Structures are given as C-alpha cells and as structure tokens.
Amino acid sequence: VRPQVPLRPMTYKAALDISHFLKEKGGLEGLIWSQRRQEILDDWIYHTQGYFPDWQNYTPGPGIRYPLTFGWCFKLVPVEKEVLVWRFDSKLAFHHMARELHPEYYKD
C-alpha cells in the first residue's frame, strides 16, 4: 500500500526515537533473535522511514552483543551457536557500550 519513502541518514536522535517507539509499541522486547526477523525489522524501517539497513549491527560474540550505532538502545542477551533475545537498556542512551569495549572500531 505505502510506497518507499525518500532516503535519509541515520542519526543518534533518530536511533533513540526508533528505540523508544519500539519499546512503547511492544513486540521486540523478549523476542528471540533470528536473522530473518532482523531482516524484517531492518527492511521495515527502510521502507517506512528511509533509513538504510546499515545501523542495526552489534558487537560480535560471545556474551551480550552491544549495538554499534550509538543511540540504538536494544542489546542481544543470551539465555540458558547461542540463543539471543532482544532487551532494551536505557543505559545505552548515555553509555556507548560498544565504544567502551572495542575502541578500535571508533579510533579513526
């Protein structure tokens, strides 16, 4: 029904607002992660809001995967080849956790 909206860059503020909207709407929190579900979400954001799927990557495992794009406030947490669930963390709004653990990704 809706066509493709014009493209725009991702920002810290836009990542915050998309994070908050997903927490308010429901659906992402507690959901088991899968590549197929990650594609459905990324492509939805892209068709509805025009952000290319280049901002929804996390730190490589093991353990908790932290978002690479500062402003994205969901993290992937293992539960007991892992099994991960989406979890909102408000600390992520103010602590760039990936840059704290992998400075090399952001030094240049």
């Binding site: 029904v1 809706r2 066509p3 909206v5 014009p6 725009r8 503020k13 836009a14 509805t48 809001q49």
Partner: protein, 56 residues
C-alpha cells in the same frame, strides 16, 4: 500558498515528523530536501513528511 493532499497513510516514528492519513490536506512550509516540513490543516501539527506521499 502550497497546499498538498495526502495520497497514503503515514505514521511518524521520528519525533520531528508529521503523521497523516489518506486525503489529509497540508500546507508545505519548507522544501529543502526530499522530506518537506508541512503543517496539518486539521490539527495544525507541524513536521517533516515524505514528499512522494502527497500531491499538488
């Protein structure tokens, strides 16, 4: 002076965007880029809108 009509439903996620429904009339305030700042004639809410979702 620049009145546009909505062709599709749009739900805004980003806080500085303007939601609307099929048929809503809006005044365009700014046209810098492909996302235009517009104002609703019904609610007088203001925000950016996907320029290809609207006509005239």
């Amino acid at each position: 002076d620049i009145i546009v009509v909505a062709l599709y439903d749009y739900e805004a996620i980003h806080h500085e965007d303007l939601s609307f429904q099929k048929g809503d009339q809006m005044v365009v305030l700014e046209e810098s880029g492909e996302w235009w700042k517009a104002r609703s004639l019904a609610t007088r809410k203001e925000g950016y809108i996907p320029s290809n979702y609207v006509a005239r």
